[PDB]
Amino acid sequence: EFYGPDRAKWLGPFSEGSVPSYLKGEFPGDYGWDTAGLSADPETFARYREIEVIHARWAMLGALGCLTPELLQNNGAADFGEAAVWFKAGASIFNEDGLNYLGNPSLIHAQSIVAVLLTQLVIMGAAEAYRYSGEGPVETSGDSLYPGGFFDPLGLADDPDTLAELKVKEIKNGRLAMFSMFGFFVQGLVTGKSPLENLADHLAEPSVNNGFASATKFLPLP
Template sequence: MNATMLKSSFVSGVAARPQLPTPFRSNGSRVCMRVNAEAQLSGNWLPGAENPKYLEGLPASYGFDPLRLGQDPGALEWYKQAELIHCRYAMAAVAGILIPDVLNKLGALNLPDWWNAGKVAQDNSPIPFNTLIALEIFAYNFVEIKRWQDFKKPGSQSEKGSFVGLEGFFQGSGENGYPGGIFDPLGLSKGPGFEAMKVREIKNGRLAMIAFLGFTGQYLATQKGPVDNLIDHLKAPLANNFTTNGVSLPIQAHPLLTVLHP
């Protein structure tokens, strides 16, 4: 076979080769790979598994219910509301930890560390501790009863006579867990993007719950807040991480890592 025949055979083979999908085609010396994260997450949390039918329609569920706790429709609705409330509490807590901590570092504020803030506030409060606890229990009980009543009968808390003439403030969005009214000053529950906002809230809330657990674990391990931990890690990543705090791992960190600490 001469050189001309070899060249012709090679060209024919290249022409007959199936084209790669667009995301994997070579572009010069670099392979362009585009991954749509949202499309990847739109399926099941466990690749190859089938989404439970009873989770269809829930924002950002991704079929995650390995213990099948949501098979009971009544229980599923309560779990949905419980996650929503925990998400909101966690987002408020994480913001309440990070924002003052950052402002302290910038010199704009001088507030106590988050794990000590409650004690400092109580030491400077004119209200005795036992009285404060009683007031908080009463307030939380009132709010939770109102939430439970609205859960059992959505919209009932805006009915006339349900709250000493102020029930108009509880005029909700009509959907359980999304109060609307004065709790939605921007009117996001009325716009076309309401469903997308639900997904964003759940995702950010889950991240906040994990972050709060991380903040708690960091303090127990290092006696520092998240901003200080981040600054220490950025200064010396190998010397300041979960392997070197003496708590996270059941084994002692390698002695060489301590040498790297500035």
Template sequence: MKIAIVSALVGSAVAFAPAPAGRSSTAVRAALNGWVPDESKFAWGLPGALPPFEDGFDPLGLSTGVPLGTIKQWREAEVSHSRVAMLAALGMLVTEEPIEFHPLFEAYNKDIGPAIRHLDEVDAVSPFFLAFLTIAIGSVEWNRALTGFAKPEGSFGFQQLNENYYPGDVRFDPLGLKPSDPAEFATMQTKELQNGRLAMLGAAGMIAQELVDGKEIFVSLGLAADRFDPSSVPIQF
């Protein structure tokens, strides 16, 4: 969880880094997954808006006049954070009371406590696992960088995306779920973004709640018994 949070924070900072202005209105015009950048539309016409905000929700005008390269960077960061948040929100719920499904713990023997401390427990028992986890996350990010990010050569901007790269499309679809029809693809990505935005708020809320009272989510809601004994785990709560 700590690594995921750090990665999200770093990604957020990177997303708002300056982008080269020279690639705005004259940038990519070829359709990417059915999307053709249109400067006259909100966020250059990228999907993700739902009624009653079909024209986009941006009360502070942060996206007004933003170059295409920067919009793509922001969307790349938003999609990446959405996916991490959806995994985090689901992971927190299934590893705590009353479900307590966790492949790294003998959860059937005892309540293993709030999810925000699970990696601390793993680190106390097997610190090499965190090194393995770091390498695994780094490998995934390395593949994303090779797929979507431009090579640092010529006129290059920090975290600049390839012109022929659609934000979030890392070409990983082992189940073949990606629609071939552009309209269906836009609908699917809108659903992913909406669920991801909710998950980012939800995961942040659950983490904050557990930091405040040190109790599991369903325990705080009164839907599960509090069986957690801090003395039963190898870390100090």
């Protein structure tokens, strides 16, 4: 159903003639969608698949991270101020009290923009360099995209049949996260309010408070 010839497709029942020959349902997420033939060459397809999974994984982290502080702010679990909104959390580091995790000054209490940036360059630079290398001190399998071993403490990938199906779950939850993250970016740019405030307004008046309410917000003026 998610692999092989009769797998699910991007156009559903009407996707017989739209599936490229190079897409044969061998990898996770193969709904036969490449109307631009960008993955015709096998080598470029493999690299694009890695980029998609890495993006999908960052988006799943990003989608959860862009809502968790705001949810805590709403129910009263913590206080962030303007930093509750995801597209305003950056300036927090420039607050006199500093970026306090969960609003607690006894936590990180970071003050230096340089320090948070240089630290990330060293850490993520090392972590990403090992990923590109394909080798490292940790124990991994031969698949760079799917290391396992050290990165699979719970043996959820041990069963090979479940691993193939769980791969579809990762990319499908991942692609939804990427689409929603693009929604967070555009809604932040267009509406200027947090994603949960956008949701609340749609619920308050769905027929009026929708995207077309801001359709004329960027009319070029003479």
